[PDB]
Design a binder for this molecule. Structure first.
Ligand SMILES: [Cl-]
Ligand SMILES: [Cl-]
Lengths: 113, 113
């Protein structure tokens, strides 16, 4: 749809359901994405995190693939995982441009050597 | 050994190896614990995080069991996982007494309701 940057099959805080993660100028969103089409998917409500609540963001190792661990002003650290190594460049650019946040690279133990 | 509070089979940042996690007055430690006895275990060096680097700590959902996500002054967010629900009370008490840190309970979505 062309405004937000979207990623499918992402998990929020080790959720059993996967969902779609969206990066918008307004902040972040995540919504359960499943089967049943317009029954089950239509009742679902999004998790919405306003950009004002973002403080730091790191790209690190998830349970599934790579993750973002996102520290917030009022809601602790939120985890999104299920990313591919391929996703990093896009994520880095989006967080810089939309939020002026530099994503920290902390996904292996040789970082900073 | 009676000074530190120790937990076995804990993983650091989704490490392939598990190790022993130790909570001491001086800060946190983690060291790979494996087989071979005094060959492989003896060469291993610990990860050491001085108490001065601790800022916030939350108890949340790991890849394995429950986790701590620990925000540090200079090293981003560190994850320890592999904890049982049983571990929480001890952890809460140790972080309060040793560091004056209140562990945030953020391990399910009904927290704060
Ligand atoms: Cl947008
Ligand atoms: Cl001690």
């Amino acid at each position: 749809q062309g405004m937000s940057t979207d990623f499918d099959r992402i998990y929020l805080n080790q959720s059993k359901f996967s969902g779609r993660f969206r990066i918008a100028d307004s902040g972040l969103g995540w919504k359960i994405s499943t089967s049943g089409g317009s029954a089950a998917n239509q009742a679902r409500k999004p998790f919405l995190l306003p950009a004002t609540e973002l403080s730091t963001v790191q790209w690190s190792r998830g349970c599934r693939g790579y993750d973002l661990k996102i520290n917030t002003k009022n809601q602790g650290v939120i985890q999104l995982d299920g990313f591919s190594q391929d996703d990093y460049n896009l994520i880095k650019n989006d967080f810089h441009r939309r939020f002026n946040i530099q994503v920290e690279q902390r996904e292996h133990s040789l970082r900073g050597w």
